Amino acid sequence: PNFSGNWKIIRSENFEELLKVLGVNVMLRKIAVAAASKYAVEIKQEGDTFYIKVSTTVYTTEINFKVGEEFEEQTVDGRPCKSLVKWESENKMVCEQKLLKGEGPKTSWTKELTNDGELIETMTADDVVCTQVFVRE
Numbered sequence: 001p002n003f004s005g006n007w008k009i010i011r012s013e014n015f016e017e018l019l020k021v022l023g024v025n026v027m028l029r030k031i032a033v034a035a036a037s038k039y040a041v042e043i044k045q046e047g048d049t050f051y052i053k054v055s056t057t058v059y060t061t062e063i064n065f066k067v068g069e070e071f072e073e074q075t076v077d078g079r080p081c082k083s084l085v086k087w088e089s090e091n092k093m094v095c096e097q098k099l100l101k102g103e104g105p106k107t108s109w110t111k112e113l114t115n116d117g118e119l120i121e122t123m124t125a126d127d128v129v130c131t132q133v134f135v136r137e
């Protein structure tokens with residue numbers, strides 16, 4: 001479908017609770033929550049190949065992958081992982097991650113296009129699910 005677009009966050013839920021699972025201390029969590037209110041996602045999708053640029057006010061990175069082929073990225077708290085994206089439905093993809101070194105919570109993310117034109121991203125650490133909602137800019 002059409003994940004392609006420039007997406008601006010309109011809602012962020014449970015992000016602090018996710019970072020807490022990930023071991024981030026309280027005051028860095030609060031500043032990161034503030035940073036998540038400026039979270040923007042730029043997506044270019046060509047077939048099952050995705051170019052995704054995620055950014056806040058002072059930081060930007062790119063995540064490029066093809067559905068079904070392993071790649072390397074980082075968890076949201078910054079630890080390197082191996083990742084594999086698969087479709088779950090026409091408009092939703094799920095990414096499973098595996099830490100490259102050491103241990104830690106089981107992390108994953110998802111992206112979904114709703115039939116209202118919203119992008120819904122979730123991020124998971126063990127038990128805790130962060131949900132962020134975007135609209136096209």
Ligand SMILES: *C\C=C(C)/C=C/C=C(C)/C=C/C1=C(C)CCCC1(C)C
Binds near residue numbers: 075076109
């Ligand atoms: C939606 C798909 C992918 C691959 C996105 C991954 C996004 C992140 C690891 C984003 C982290 C951020 C959050 C949620 C808010 C503060 C700072 C970032 C923008 C880096």
